[PDB]
Amino acid sequence: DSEEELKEAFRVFDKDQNGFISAAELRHVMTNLGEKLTDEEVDEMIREADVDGDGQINYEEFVKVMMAK
């Protein structure tokens, strides 16, 4: 199930594992990834993906961002 795989990815991104992805958490995941992004790229991606501006991306939102852009 592709959708199931997406949720696995979501679970991977959420280190805190509270059903939310934070720039800090996302930053750490990208760091482990062996990829080194700047704070601005990380923030811009997060803000671009932050629609409620809440500063965090929930799964539903992650799905919308992951499904599209």
Binding residues for Ca ion (CB under 5 A): 16, 18, 20, 22, 52, 54, 61
Amino acid found at 12: V
Q: Which of 8/16 has CB closer to Ca ion?
A: 16
CB 50 within 8 A of CB 57: yes
What is the nearest approach in angstroms of Ca ion to the Cβ of residue 3? 20
Q: Which of 16/41 has CB closer to Ca ion?
A: 16
Instruction: Tell me the HSE value of 29 on the side-chain side, using a 13 A CA sphere.
Output: 16
Q: Which residues are annotated as a binding site for Ca(2+)?
A: 14, 16, 18, 25, 50, 52, 54, 56, 61
Beta-bridge partner residues of 57: 21
